[PDB]
Design a protein around this ligand. Structure first.
Ligand code: NA
Ligand code: NA
Lengths: 311, 311
């Protein structure tokens, strides 16, 4: 019901701006940062500088311990901002100071206020280096303890989706779009008009597994678009483990006014077929009138036990 | 000081028997099973049938939920057996009913009595099938929540170490020997006479990280045996992640009376060199007079964040 999306650090702030630009419905936005200049580029109504005394508005120096202390020092302000939320999406890039350190604090605060708490985070590109990778892993570990479900987006896999000539700036931009998709894929089903909506209880079920979660996105146009987009979503490089490993599955199929119930069910069947016979699966559909013939299928698959996929 | 090794199910019971056969010092042995016939093959002084009413001595039917309930029903008996332990090694194969379900209960009991609680478990061979793999992953997940450190031994990697003509029976036997090595590698350093012993506090440090732990074993003979065994241990297929990912490292070098302090330090240097500059590393050495020219180096590396190594 009351849904808040809280963007923590640069990548999270970008995901929040993308949602606002795209007029995503039914949610309140909160932008959090230690970097006051980055925060002043936010489009969010609620802009929350944390660590003012500690960081002086200059960011966390890529130190997760500073992001953490900043969040701890602004605990009261965060609690007030999230008060009464039924669901909170805590969205952040991992590997820096602010996202890595503050997001897990914010997540535990959201849990403590009684919110269904969903983390949506990116693992940094390998090109960012080993220190970024290691810090990110620390953050992902803390986030996993602090949320109900943690959706982890591997940025390296984005480089498998986009053109090989994609510039680095656009690669980051695409990462932040995938973050936005991880949030909107779920929130739209609860908040926005479609052929099939889900209530909080429905979502709440699959979003309360242990392990971690992954997402896949598929886009298609043309007569066989529903089957094609559904297969693309489950075959997505973002979905690093096959969906038959998942304990729960949510499917969102979004399209224009020419998307039919038959297409929704056909896509759902394909996803169900690739899943465990005992999966808990839910699905919905929403209409975006700016789509003509394009449809977008987002699968969120939860309950992957990390130990099963250890290299 | 008071060290207990508790073998839970068939694989754990085998590891316990191997230690007893090899006269491992300084530890008390407890064998646990739901299968009364398997338990009557134990050499352990304390033999603990669990789930007598529930399973009638016939085992858990490969159902982890039955192993769990059996352990829960014998909680009092387990608490009495472990009472006062300073350290408890909970050793089990994962993927069956008894090991998978009972070991995590036993581990949390050991934690609740104030023991430093180390899990040493095997992941089943792939040839055992998908159901075994999935059950095992569930168990590893529960064990990780219930111990201070969880050492995970991938049985498939044993097939990379042994002869390609090794029969299946001997493959299982080798798995259970690696389990024993995971326990004795640590316990011998606290309990058994050597060039260099470690006290509880020393171990306790590296055994209290988060994430999971891995082990590597190296064996060599001849003039350059110490350097060779140390390099073999850190290059071991059992050590599925490179040791520079670890937060803590223990090295045990064991040999006959011809093993020198120089050799111990040389091996320790090689291990330290391959580790993170900021690793917490400890090492010791013990003498086994039945070794002539052979030495054995065991590395236990703790604090691997599982998310970092997700496929
Ligand atoms: Na950041
Ligand atoms: Na068993």
């Amino acid at each position: 019901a009351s849904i808040k999306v809280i963007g923590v650090g640069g990548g999270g702030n970008n995901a929040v701006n993308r949602m606002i630009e795209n007029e995503v419905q039914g949610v309140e936005y909160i932008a959090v940062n230690t970097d006051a200049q980055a925060l002043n580029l936010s489009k969010a109504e609620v802009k929350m500088q944390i660590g003012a005394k500690l960081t002086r508005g200059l960011g966390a120096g890529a130190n997760p311990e500073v992001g953490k202390k900043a969040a701890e020092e602004s605990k009261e302000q965060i609690e007030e901002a999230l008060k009464g939320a039924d669901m909170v999406f805590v969205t952040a890039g991992m590997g820096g100071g602010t996202g890595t350190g503050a997001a897990p604090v914010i997540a535990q605060i959201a849990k403590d206020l009684g919110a269904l708490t969903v983390g949506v985070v990116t693992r940094p590109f390998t090109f960012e280096g080993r220190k970024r990778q290691l810090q990110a892993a620390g953050g992902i570990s803390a986030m996993k303890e602090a949320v109900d479900t943690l959706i982890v987006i591997p940025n390296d896999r984005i480089l498998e989706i986009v053109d090989k000539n994609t510039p680095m700036l656009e690669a980051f931009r695409e990462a932040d779009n995938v973050l936005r998709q991880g949030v909107q894929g779920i929130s739209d089903l609860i908040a926005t008009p479609g052929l099939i909506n889900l209530d909080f209880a429905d979502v709440k079920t699959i979003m309360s597994n242990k392990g971690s979660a992954l997402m896949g996105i598929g886009i298609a146009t043309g007569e066989n678009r529903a089957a094609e987009a559904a297969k693309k979503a489950i075959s997505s490089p973002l979905l690093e483990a096959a969906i038959d490993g998942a304990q729960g599955v949510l499917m969102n199929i979004t399209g224009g006014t020419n998307l039919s119930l038959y297409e929704v069910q056909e896509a759902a069947d394909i996803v169900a077929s690739a899943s465990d016979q005992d999966v808990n699966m839910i699905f919905g559909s929403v209409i975006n009138e700016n789509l003509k013939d394009e449809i977008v299928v987002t699968v969120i698959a939860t309950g992957f036990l990390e130990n099963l996929y250890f290299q």
